[PDB]
Amino acid sequence: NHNLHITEKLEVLAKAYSVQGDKWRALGYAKAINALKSFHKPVTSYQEACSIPGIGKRMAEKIIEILESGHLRKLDHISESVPVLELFSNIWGAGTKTAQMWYQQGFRSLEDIRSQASLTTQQAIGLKHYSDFLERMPREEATEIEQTVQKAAQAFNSGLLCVACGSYRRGKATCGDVDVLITHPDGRSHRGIFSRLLDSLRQEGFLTDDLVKGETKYLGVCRLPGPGRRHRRLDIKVVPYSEFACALLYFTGSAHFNRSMRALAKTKGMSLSDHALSTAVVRNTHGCKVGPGRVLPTPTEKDVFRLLGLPYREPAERDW
DNA sequence: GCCG
DNA sequence: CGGCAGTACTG
DNA sequence: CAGTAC
Ligand SMILES: [Ca+2]
Ligand code: NA
Ligand code: NA
């Protein structure tokens, strides 16, 4: 908040390292960004920055240069390919490997991608709604989208439960996308409902394009009826009710929150996933699962916190 | 990039 | 030194 | 499987 003059410089280097394939170095920048945004005072000393968790010796040296000289010399040495890679990676379905290949092939704009680049089915859809997918909708519009899916699902089974997660359930004023989670408390009526639910949403012209049509999760594009409506990202994950709490917790977010929770689960001999919070998960020296462990009963989100020795945090308190 |  | 979340999904 | 996104 009060250190935005330091976080904005590191944020450019974080996107540059991310789009260039250095995902782990970009992870250290992202956690240093979140630590600076939540710190209590504008940093003014080298020892003050090193004492912060998530900021080591190198990150504190970069904080020192921003205060003393007002610039980061590495920002003057960012590869000219980075802005072009950010343009390509924003295409949904196109990541760092695809963006780097397109820049290697000589492409510099989305016009080069439209006319000359080899596109997958998902990349062509993400490009078709390039401007629409970069916009965060008001949470009012996200409510209309969740009610559209919920009415179609409950039309065949009124006992179905539909909860919108992501940034929406965290209480954010705007939402990047809509994460609709569907389940049924009887543990069985959720079977084979994807074919009937998505067909009902297509008959009314609500679904415009389809990105992923899997057994459990569905990713796609939708647009509310009427004028002035943008194409918004829509997700529909259907889970068994025995896995509803872990799925609700993962899909509510945020992404970093899940990564700190699942890391803490590993430090306690447990394994947290969008399916279940297993305990006694066996592993080797590489932190790789060799024993499946046993699913712990988690009927609510509070049970996942309790089994992890954590006090419960509301969805609005899960941004870090 | 950070951390144990 | 070496992990850094786990998994569904798609070709 | 690599790549991508959840
Ligand atoms: Ca979101
Ligand atoms: Na430290
Ligand atoms: Na993308």
For chain A, domains (ranges, CATH) are: 4-77 (1.10.150.110), 81-128 (1.10.150.20), 137-239 (3.30.460.10), 255-317 (3.30.210.10)
Residue A192: phi and psi, rounded to 5, are: 65, 20
Nucleotide nearest to A35 (CA to C1'): B2
**Cβ partners under 8 Å of residue A29, min gap 6:** A10, A11, A13, A14, A17, A59
What is the β-pairing status of strands A178-183 and A232-238?
parallel
Q: Give the separation between CA A107 and CA A229, rounded to whole angstroms.
A: 31
How far apart are alpha carbons A186 and A158 in whole angstroms? Answer: 12
Query: Helix or strand or coil: residue A222?
Result: strand
User: What is the C-alpha R_g of chain A?
Assistant: 22
Structure determined via = X-ray
Pair type for strands A137-138 and A174-175: antiparallel
Which run of H or E residues covers position A278?
Answer: strand A277-279
Cα separation, A249 vs A305, in Å, equals: 10
Q: Give the Cα separation of A233 and A179 in Å (integer).
A: 9
Closest CA to A274 of A235, A317, A233: A235
Cα separation of the two ends of chain A: 14
The single residue of A15, A62, A217, A237 carrying the catalytic annotation is: A62
Protein residue with the closest CA to the C1' atom of nucleotide C5? A259
Beta bridge partners, A174, equal A138
The resolution of the experimental structure, rounded to one decimal in Å, is 3.0
Shortest CA distance to A299 belongs to which of A232, A228, A236, A248?
A: A248
**What residues have CB less than 8 Å from A127, skipping those under 6 apart?**
A91, A110, A113, A114, A119
Round to whole Å and give the CA distance between A302 and A41: 32
- A61: tokens are 């040296």
Q: Which residues of A are annotated as a binding site for Mn(2+)?
A: 177, 179, 235
Q: Which long-range contacts (CB under 8 A, 24 or more apart) does A214-222 make?
A: A218/A194, A221/A125, A221/A129, A222/A145, A222/A148, A222/A178
Residues A254/A318, Cβ–Cβ less than 8 Å: yes
Chain C nucleotides reached by a protein CB under 7 Å:
2-11
Please confirm whether the linkage preceding A242 is cis (ω < 30° from 0).
Answer: no
Q: Output the CA A31–ligand 2 centroid distance in Å.
A: 13
Q: Over the range A125-147, which residues count as b (16 or more CB within 10 Å of their CB) and which as e?
A: bbbbbbebbeeebebebbeebbe
Distance in angstroms (rounded) separating the CA atoms of residues A303 and A297: 8
Residue type, A143: T
